[PDB]
């Protein structure tokens, strides 16, 4: 590492604007970018990924399925990494939840075109009614 750079001038302005929660009274700050950095390296994940539109995405992939059995720490992570990610994907949000909706909407479409072979294990079919 020579010159670290997570959020540029533009990303900074928007970052400070974005909130951690939809129904809160606090916005985002460097405190969250640095904090998540320390917790990241702890999970064998370098903080340099936070400044990468690609890394931020992967980090959410491992936390996604972890959210089911994750603690307060995992929450703040998936929440922060979610906002920072959208920032690198030319995405604009107002809160953390908002970003999640976008990341989930973009994935929901890339769910059927991801397997096309391993999506026939269970059993589920559409509904049929009259009129």
Ligand X SMILES: CCCCCCCC(=O)OC[C@H](COP(=O)(O)OC[C@H](N)C(=O)O)OC(=O)CCCCCCC
Give the interface with ligand X as residue ranges (CB under 6 A): 40, 43, 45, 59, 62-63, 66, 69, 77
State the nearest-atom distance from the C-beta of 65 to ligand X, in Å: 9
End-to-end CA distance of the chain: 64
Nearer to ligand X, 63 or 86 (CB): 63
- Compute the least distance from the CB of residue 49 to ligand X, in Å: 9
Nearer to ligand X, 80 or 95 (CB): 80
Reduced to 3 states, what is the DSSP secondary structure of residue 121?
coil
Smallest separation (angstroms) from ligand X to the CB of 45: 5
- Cβ at position 68, least distance to ligand X in Å: 10
Q: How far apart are CA 15 and CA 39, in angstroms?
A: 19
Largest CA distance in the chain: 66
Q: Which is nearer to ligand X, 62 or 107 (CB)?
A: 62
Structural contact between residues 89 and 107, judged by C-beta atoms closer than 8 angstroms: no
**DSSP at 6:** S
């Amino acid at each position: 590492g020579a010159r670290a750079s997570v959020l540029s001038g533009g990303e900074l302005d928007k970052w400070e604007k974005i909130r951690l929660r939809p129904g809160g009274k606090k916005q985002y700050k460097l405190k969250h970018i640095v904090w998540a950095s320390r917790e990241l390296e702890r999970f064998a994940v370098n903080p340099g990924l936070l400044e990468t539109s690609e890394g931020c995405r992967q980090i959410l992939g491992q936390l996604q399925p972890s959210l089911q059995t994750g603690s307060e720490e995992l929450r703040s992570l998936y929440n922060t990494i979610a906002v920072l990610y959208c920032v690198h994907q030319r995405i604009d949000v107002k809160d953390t939840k908002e970003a999640l909706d976008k990341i989930e909407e973009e994935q929901n479409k890339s769910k059927k075109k991801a397997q096309q072979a391993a999506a026939d294990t269970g059993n589920n079919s559409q509904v049929s009614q009259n009129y």
